[PDB]
Amino acid sequence: EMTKVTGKFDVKLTPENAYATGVGGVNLGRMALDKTFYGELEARSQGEMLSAMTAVKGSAGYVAIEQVVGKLCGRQGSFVLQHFGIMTDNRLHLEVVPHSGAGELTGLYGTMAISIENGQHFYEFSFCFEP
């Protein structure tokens, strides 16, 4: 039922000042996100990420929301991706926010995955359209 595509993306993450302060070995972060997707998703995104690093190695959490604008498989539109990640020594959920799809991407539903191979970021996007 899901269409499945992969491609490359670039990401730039600019530090920002976090409202709250970490205690007990926690360090909190806020970052601005700018990304460019190439291939079947040919798009630009902007958003923000929040982060919490703990005093234990490899243990951290991230969340983000990003607005994507471009083309998916030729259809011009926009949608929002919402991220939840927990690294303990990794669990990542990246989901299209329901009814965030607009333009020719109205009705979009789906989830994305990512990886990094030799410094190159890649995405997989599993998606479909609500009838």
Added chain:
Amino acid sequence: EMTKVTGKFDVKLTPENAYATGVGGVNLGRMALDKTFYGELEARSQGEMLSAMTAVKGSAGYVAIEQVVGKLCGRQGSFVLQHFGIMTDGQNRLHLEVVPHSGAGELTGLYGTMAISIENGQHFYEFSFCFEPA
């Protein structure tokens, strides 16, 4: 068995400037969060939330990270809570967990998930927690 404690909390949301701009009917937000928990979790927290409201009533998403400081069943410490909420048709499906190894002080090793309810206009937390072996 997990211990499950229930109690009141209040939250203040202060609007901040979101980096991105929503399009296609989406409105994106960033807010500062200041909360107070009462009862078995007696604590204060600060953090931020990011939200996306869509053009369709009852459909939205939000995420947040907050640092909690206070007492849980009498023991003083801190931990971080991490939220991921997706609402469709007005029904929020919320995942809210303690970030592993964020527990400090006497709450070192804290593990847990929290649910959020409302009764007569008052928010309540239901917090199921335990501790990992020292």
